[PDB]
Design a binder for this molecule. Sequence first.
Ligand SMILES: CC1=N[C@@H]2[C@@H](O)[C@H](O)[C@@H](CO)O[C@@H]2S1
Ligand SMILES: [Cl-]
Ligand SMILES: [Cl-]
Ligand SMILES: [Cl-]
Length: 499
Amino acid sequence: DRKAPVRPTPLDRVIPAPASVDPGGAPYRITRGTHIRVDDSREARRVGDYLADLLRPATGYRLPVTAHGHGGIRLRLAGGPYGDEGYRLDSGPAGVTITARKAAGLFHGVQTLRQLLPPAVEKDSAQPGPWLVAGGTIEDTPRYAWRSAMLDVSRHFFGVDEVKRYIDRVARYKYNKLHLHLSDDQGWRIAIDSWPRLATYGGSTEVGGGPGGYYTKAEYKEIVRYAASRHLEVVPEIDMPGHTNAALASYAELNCDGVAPPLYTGTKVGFSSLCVDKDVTYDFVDDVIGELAALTPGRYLHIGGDEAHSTPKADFVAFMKRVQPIVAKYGKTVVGWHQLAGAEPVEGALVQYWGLDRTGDAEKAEVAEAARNGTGLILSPADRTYLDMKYTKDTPLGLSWAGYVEVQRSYDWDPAGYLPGAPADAVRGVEAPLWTETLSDPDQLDYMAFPRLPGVAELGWSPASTHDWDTYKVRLAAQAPYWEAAGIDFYRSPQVPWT
Ligand SMILES: CC1=N[C@@H]2[C@@H](O)[C@H](O)[C@@H](CO)O[C@@H]2S1
Ligand SMILES: [Cl-]
Ligand SMILES: [Cl-]
Ligand SMILES: [Cl-]
């Protein structure tokens, strides 16, 4: 009876671990007549409809969403100590009420509610239930404001629907940002009107060759819209000056020698570089960032900056000196991989650290120094949160350059004191990147994303005081029947006592 537990799931048994859990009294039971009461606002109803859509299939209930009456499930916006993303969830025979200051908070409360319900809730056909919600109160707020998941659509392209699917996977764990690696050596995935070939030619293939793909502006806007409905702020990335072969292959004039390189379909890195010496390089960058900014309602613009190994340190610094301001010109906050820390980050910038344990002190120091100078830090250690890294030497997909990363290793650490000498207040959050050199379909993304994805979300959301592998693995283990019911393939780590 894994799919239909005899009794309700513990109120504290959710991922991320809630900031505060106070169980008590009897649970609430959703019955055929349960109404979803929301405030009389478009945003409030939006969350209500979202919730209704998640429950209707498995319950087979009407679950109407209205702005009147005393529905058994109440979503209400009101003042309180919950910030822009927190909420309170009260459960008892009198019903379930989720209170928050903003829609995002209600949305997060919903993500908790779906875990409080039984595994059968994931099914697409009417299930017996019962639809119980442990009784008590949960007061929940996030530790970090930057909790993202990155999807590489450059190595292997994933269409709009596949991205929507991944978005739903991450929305389950309260991630609030979706970083999209839109360009690299093997592909350019976003149409740029001023430079048409980037997409038509630069997006013509991918790793392994064959058809590639790219997002027309309409498709990209739909991805942003959908992400926004799941309260994910999209952070687009146009990697530069390295990892730029798709662009270079599309316009010969972008290459220092004026010759266009062949489209790249391999899985190596570091050989490409924009021409720091040419003026057209900066017109190109300005045009791209300008058009990308117009498609980005979010606050950030990621310019990459990683592995520009064919770019002399001096040219890299000069390049970043010149391009960073372009981001602000179009009203956005720049984000770059931590190599940017060695090229003078502008005010307000954030750098994403992707080093690992074996990374040298000098490199870590440069990043910690940037933090000291006001640069925000996003932590995504390659031997910690990279979803493309193999679990063990036997994992069929993924890479292993950063070693092997089992479930415990991915979860068992504290962002606050991870980087030596880095001020804890400089840590904006964490990110779980999923590179796709070896992944070409949605099922493979799931296998490499789960079960580590929930863990990184917890690191970004939960209080340090709730962090504990031995108790966390029990909560993680409880997800098995839900994932199985949802058709979400995942790695059955031997380190987890799967339910
Ligand atoms: C930043 C980074 N740049 C590289 C990416 O281009 C690869 O896809 C990834 C594979 O794990 O490794 C590092 S992370
Ligand atoms: Cl999902
Ligand atoms: Cl190669
Ligand atoms: Cl390589």
